[PDB]
Write a protein that binds this ligand. Structure first.
Ligand SMILES: [Hg+2]
Ligand SMILES: [Hg+2]
Ligand SMILES: [Hg+2]
Ligand SMILES: [Hg+2]
Ligand SMILES: [Hg+2]
Length: 262
């Protein structure tokens, strides 16, 4: 779409001969940024996305006992997720009446969809996350792109042969030992509505094929196969999907933004 000029802004000059980070990879081999603290100026990005009147959809499934995680999830999203931008939460649940009444900031809305094209007209981007989580620091427009995945926090330092991809050749999710860029976790992915729908359609079909052939990480295996074959346009660092009880707070993580609930 047509993009208006940015206003005058005052910020430190980028330093061509100073790397952002010397401890981590900040760009994939297909030139997608890998999003770590210290790589982005959020004021620039906020301007760019507000000038497009960007709306972000946040989708969460909360079935059976998982409804209990909604209150903390939504309260913390209010403090940390896309603050200043238009947000539409979509809570898919078998217990609509048990969704807690959480107070939202202006320009933010929540829809409860009961489970046993709306997204295209309502939001620009869709972000798909697990509900048994809390935001502890900024998660903002720096993630937005046509298609993103997030590095699994248990495997970011692992060699690809150790990745727990699907290794049975009979599965549609099969990845051999000599293939793989990263191990992505399904607990946080997203993109444009069109790209997220492409992904979820592909995954659903591959899973149907495997079921027909008698074969069943499941969600993570199919995601990982899709993102191998359709490279994400941004990758989120493990700042964006962490478990402090399991993994601590290593020096490489400057912020812990979205985490497991103890
Ligand atoms: Hg930098
Ligand atoms: Hg989704
Ligand atoms: Hg989702
Ligand atoms: Hg897939
Ligand atoms: Hg998937």
């Amino acid at each position: 779409e047509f993009m208006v000029s940015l206003p005058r802004m005052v910020y430190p000059q980028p330093k061509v001969l100073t790397p952002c980070r010397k401890d981590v990879l900040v760009v994939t081999p297909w030139l997608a940024p890998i999003v770590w603290e210290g790589t982005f100026n959020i004021d620039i990005l906020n301007e760019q996305f507000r000038l497009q009147n960007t709306t972000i959809g946040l989708t969460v499934f909360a079935i059976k006992k998982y409804v209990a995680f909604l209150k903390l999830f939504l309260e913390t999203a209010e403090k940390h997720f896309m603050v200043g931008h238009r947000v539409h939460y979509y809570v898919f649940t078998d217990q609509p009446a048990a969704v807690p009444r959480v107070t939202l900031g202006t320009g933010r809305q929540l829809s409860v969809l009961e489970v046993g094209r709306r997204f295209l007209s309502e939001v620009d981007y869709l972000v798909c996350v697990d509900v048994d989580m809390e935001f502890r620091d900024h998660v903002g427009v720096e993630i937005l792109t046509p298609l993103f995945g997030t590095l699994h926090p248990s495997f970011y330092g692992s060699s690809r042969e150790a990745f727990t991809y699907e290794r049975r050749p009979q599965s549609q999710a099969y990845i051999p030992k000599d293939e793989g860029d990263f191990y992505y976790m399904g607990a946080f992915f997203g993109g444009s509505v069109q790209e997220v729908q492409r992904l979820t359609r592909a995954c659903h079909q591959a899973m149907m094929v495997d079921q027909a052939n008698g074969i069943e990480w499941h969600d993570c295996s199919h995601l990982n196969k899709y993102l191998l074959r359709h490279k994400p346009t941004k990758v989120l660092s493990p700042e964006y999907l962490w478990d402090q009880q399991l993994l601590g707070w290593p020096a490489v993580l400057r912020k812990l933004r979205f985490t497991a609930v103890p």
